Amino acid sequence: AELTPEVLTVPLNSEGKTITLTEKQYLEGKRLFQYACASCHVGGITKTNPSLDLRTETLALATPPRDNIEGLVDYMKNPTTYDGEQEIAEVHPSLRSADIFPKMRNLTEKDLVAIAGHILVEPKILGDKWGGGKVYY
Amino acid sequence: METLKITVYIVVTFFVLLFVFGFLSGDPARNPKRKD
Amino acid sequence: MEVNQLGLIATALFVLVPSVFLIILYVQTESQQ
């Protein structure tokens, strides 16, 4: 197996538009996810609230939908609850909350998309392990 | 219980003082060769 | 038969303890002469 453009092709938006990532961006996204996210989201779970994972099926059913780069980027800008009814920048790292979540201060918008692609590519590689938890280690 | 606590404190105390004073009593001289 | 379980241990010891006593005294008698 290898890391191929077809693996590295994920939804850009919900219209169906897609986009294709390079090896370099996916690896950048992994490095950055580790820097800013993995303390809570290692392997696609969420330590501080296990009921919500980063499986693409979970993301798809969020409001707004987040199985695509734009809505994931928007979530890193202005996060909300799963039903979209409340904003949670106060307790979830975001660009809106770079003052109290310092690690977001220096993230470029291209950095956020790398993080999104990583999140969207990783379950295609790991399948159930991603968001699965210790059952699948 | 109060009575047990005091009794243990005294006992412990007594033994601890034996230890201190015993080693203070010229313990270096108590060997089979040189009495410094 | 529905028999006293301890009968066995009782019988074995009843035999074994006094017999070993006698053997001990006999063998050390022969080691003298």
């Binding site: 290898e2 191929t4 590689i125 210790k134 280690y137 | 606590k5 006992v11 230890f19 | -």
Partner: protein, 334 residues
Amino acid sequence: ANLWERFCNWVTSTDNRLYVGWFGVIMIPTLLAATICFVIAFIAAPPVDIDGIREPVSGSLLYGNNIITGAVVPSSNAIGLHFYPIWEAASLDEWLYNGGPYQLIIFHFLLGASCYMGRQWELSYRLGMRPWICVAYSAPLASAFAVFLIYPIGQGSFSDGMPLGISGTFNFMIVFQAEHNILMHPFHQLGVAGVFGGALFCAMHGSLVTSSLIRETTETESANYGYKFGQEEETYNIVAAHGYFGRLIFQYASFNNSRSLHFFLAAWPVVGVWFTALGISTMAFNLNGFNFNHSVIDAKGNVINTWADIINRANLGMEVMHERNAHNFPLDLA
């Protein structure tokens, strides 16, 4: 002389069948209290709520144990590291429920065994000996301190000290492997080399000296009678043992100096057990064994399991079953 000097002279007498000494003055009462309490609790103590969840574990023979399953059970998690003398309980019944005997035993025992170490130095001084036997003993003593004192400190509870029991000890080792991957820790690997190598070198030296015993007996008597206690001369031909062993491997992998040989015998196990005691003592602060989980991945990024991942599947079974009623939140952080 006067009374206190008579007492001092008796305490430090080299004529007593067992040496007392100043360290002995503390050692004797603390070891007696530990032993007496331990023997009575092992036979008759009622069940103890080790994990603080009102789920008492039965450890004594009279409450359904045998020699292998019985133990004196660590004190309640609800207590943590708080001091729980008898006089702090409202009743002996409360003290027994919450595991008070464990605290009494371990504290008197750690103190007695520390003074046992000091007593070894003390007699060696009174006899005119070199003093470092007690250093050797420090390896087992430090081991004991680790499982009964240090590891509870780092983890916040004497409920996680080692139980005083055969199966309790196994319980402690299994949970330790899941919580710290001690098998993958270099210091415990050093400890295994320490004790395997101790055993190996023990058998080697015994076999080599035994092989070169000087014919001093007939075939109908124990060879052991060829040696007489205090005899001037050596009863084995060390040149011959070197000649044998030097050829078994090669001439310089072998020791012809007795003093250097016996110093090696002392140092190998002592050092190794220092390291494994330091290993428990630092995993006490959650610096754990190497972690190689998902450490190999393929060009795409599939996980390619190694033997470390199989170990981890075992660890995970231990993790999720131990203390099955004790965790409410998803990480087991102590």
